[PDB]
Symmetry: D2
Subunit: 240 residues, 4 copies
Amino acid sequence: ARTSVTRREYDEWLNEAAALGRALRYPVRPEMVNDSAGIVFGEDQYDAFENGLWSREPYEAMVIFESLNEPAVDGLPAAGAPFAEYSGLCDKLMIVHPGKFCPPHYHQRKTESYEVVLGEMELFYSPKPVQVGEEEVLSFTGMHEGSPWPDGVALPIGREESYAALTSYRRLRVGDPKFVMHRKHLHAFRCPADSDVPLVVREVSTYSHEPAPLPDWAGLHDNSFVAAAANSGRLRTAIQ
Amino acid sequence: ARTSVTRREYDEWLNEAAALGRALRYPVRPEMVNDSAGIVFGEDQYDAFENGLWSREPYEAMVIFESLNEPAVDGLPAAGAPFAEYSGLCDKLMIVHPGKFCPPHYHQRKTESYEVVLGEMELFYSPKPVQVGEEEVLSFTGMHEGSPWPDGVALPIGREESYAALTSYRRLRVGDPKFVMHRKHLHAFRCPADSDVPLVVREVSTYSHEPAPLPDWAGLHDNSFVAAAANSGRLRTAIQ
Amino acid sequence: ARTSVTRREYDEWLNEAAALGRALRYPVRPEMVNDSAGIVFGEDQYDAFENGLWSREPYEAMVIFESLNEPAVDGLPAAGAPFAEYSGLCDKLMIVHPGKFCPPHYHQRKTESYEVVLGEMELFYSPKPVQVGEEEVLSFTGMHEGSPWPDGVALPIGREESYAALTSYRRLRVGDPKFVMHRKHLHAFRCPADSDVPLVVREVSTYSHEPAPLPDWAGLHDNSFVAAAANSGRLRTAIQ
Amino acid sequence: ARTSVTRREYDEWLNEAAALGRALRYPVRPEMVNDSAGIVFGEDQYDAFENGLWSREPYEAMVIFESLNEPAVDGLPAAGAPFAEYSGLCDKLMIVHPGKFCPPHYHQRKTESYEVVLGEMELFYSPKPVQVGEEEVLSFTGMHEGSPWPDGVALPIGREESYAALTSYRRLRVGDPKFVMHRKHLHAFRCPADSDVPLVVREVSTYSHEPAPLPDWAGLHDNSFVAAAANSGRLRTAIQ
Ligand SMILES: [Mn+2]
Ligand SMILES: [Mn+2]
Ligand SMILES: [Mn+2]
Ligand SMILES: [Mn+2]
């Protein structure tokens, strides 16, 4: 069971990913292609590189080039500081290879939108949000129900369970309408294992908190993954 | 002095603009190409169509295809409703022809980011925000100073003044970093008059209020144009 | 019945076409955007501009940006001069708006290939080549049969006849294999009248003779259009 | 000294190259992505894979997706068969990684054109053609002189000499005019070692003879590489 990705493996992975992005017209500047864009969700997932990203095997891994992550604090009424973290502007391109996933997780503050740039995205999610604290929350459009998963979705071994709660399915393609994923909703997507290209999608969402706009913003955790193993990973990718 | 755009003029304008968008890989669906995307800022500006969009003359006009404008209310703490309008997710592509402008204006709630897809964008703005009400506002990164205007920027006749306060300049190109324009800041951009293609840019910003997420969101005006004439226009484009 | 295209009409037509080209990644340099790229096939066809290129009306018109047209004479054996004209390298992008056609014609020397860049191309042609002279010609792969025309192909009024001989149909899309159109074959294509974007296609073919590589190449006519009217046009477009 | 490329190495190499192609809008169909597109020029060059394609090391290797290679025999006068091989239509996209080369070689029949799709191409060539046989050859535009090589062009070890005769230099970029390379001219290009993306270029040339349009076309060799070692390779790539 591999426990890390080699330097060559990582660089080629993010270097191909970077060029594929620019071609697809995304402003990926070298500053952004770094030892953090490449993500492996868990020590169990480093086996993704035992056969390669073109192996078509079910693993939790991806690359994320972030071009923007504006807090949007400036100009906001002082009385809005308490809730300023539920706002903000994040823009990032994500690259997922055939068969690979972006593990089941939900965000307390972040609300995301998806725009397929290349390939097809099989989105999985829970139509019901999670009750984060006894506090009262607003409603409006919520998350619709969606469709039944298509047959044959191979899930990473040992993470089979983390997908249970994500009953709703959705197939987003290039050209489709923008898809909104409200905070507090369990989501996860994958690139069809039999894809001919890597899934590529522009994520326009609210601020991305990653472990100072405001003092109370200091190291906030906004990523909550079902499978605990995934949590010990998103933090960084072990590169030899 | 023409006082409206003919049906053919408008359709060709938005239909070229629509195709140009899809080619540049923006998800412009026909639903979005409507009698509203095409905007003429003021009765004084319908003269843009006397010689055409490729006349290279200084006029205030543009097309905006909006793919997303999510309120981001769902999942927000009830106690955040008062400030929920300062958040939200808007995604739109804008097309500005050579010599044309997006008139001087500022938003009280909206914070924008720019990503040049095609061409070059000559951004003009005021380094100081405006004092909207006696209420207290937050700070953090603010707006940097920028550079002096390049010589020879022809401004639309009769609107010469509205650009005065926008002393800071900036030339954003394809590939450059995401450019953030904080709310309360006077902004305005143009496509260089001697351009060979239309300027095209992806605007990722906070919710765009246009004349119901929450009761108090009912018909909110978040667009404040310097030149009053521009105001009586953004509302709609007179098409014969 | 309009008998010419105005300067603004022409410029806007080729200027939108030019930018759409670069966006689709075709090397359209300004030298190429000239008073010749825009083509109207016959005086009967200037009525295309009566309602516009977005009229969706059946007319023979198009724009052709030629990036290459190499004779490929250098390095060729002296003994090959007689047949050097059937060789050469031409590279051009073509833009056809919804409902418009590229009139029925055949080339004696030129053999073309099509690559759909944007939109869909409805190709019409004759499965049998024409007997040009009593001279003996070679064979090999020839032109396959193809399919029946789909219902509802509106043809330009008065040119209805010139399409008779082109019984074979073919719908080429972006991604499809390269389609080869051998010389001596009657062809003509159009952009589906109900298209949402202009048809755009990369034509890679042999040398394009337009009214000196070799003395005998001096002003050669390699374009032979069925409808006589089309012939007196391809020469130039009447611009006011 | 590695003497072959592993299955995974090969696949990932061509799989990334294939998707990069489609993104840049080239019609790369799966049939085209095969155990031949990936090319290693010589057993001395398999060490390219010891550190990877992103090693930035000087090696002779590349991938070539061929979409068209029409003989253009059909419709040609019987009396033209002797010279039909100097004609034809080849269309292919080529992918060269940072620091890698396309070894010095010349073609007796083929004449090529280059169009940079992505990156920058540093083309090297000899301004004088080679005298292939006592036969007489035609002339017209020939090959201009060009420029001095830029300092610091690292050449693959052991092949340093094969570049000597290619004294003329040229830097072709996206948007530049079509570049024509006449047959009988020694050429070779590379992607700048410090490139951020792989060089990608559309090669539109005459028929590409690879070891039956006409009987005398049977297995013709039109590729003549300076370094002998390169010749024993282009034939096939050793994959474990
Ligand atoms: Mn997420
Ligand atoms: Mn604005
Ligand atoms: Mn033709
Ligand atoms: Mn060659």
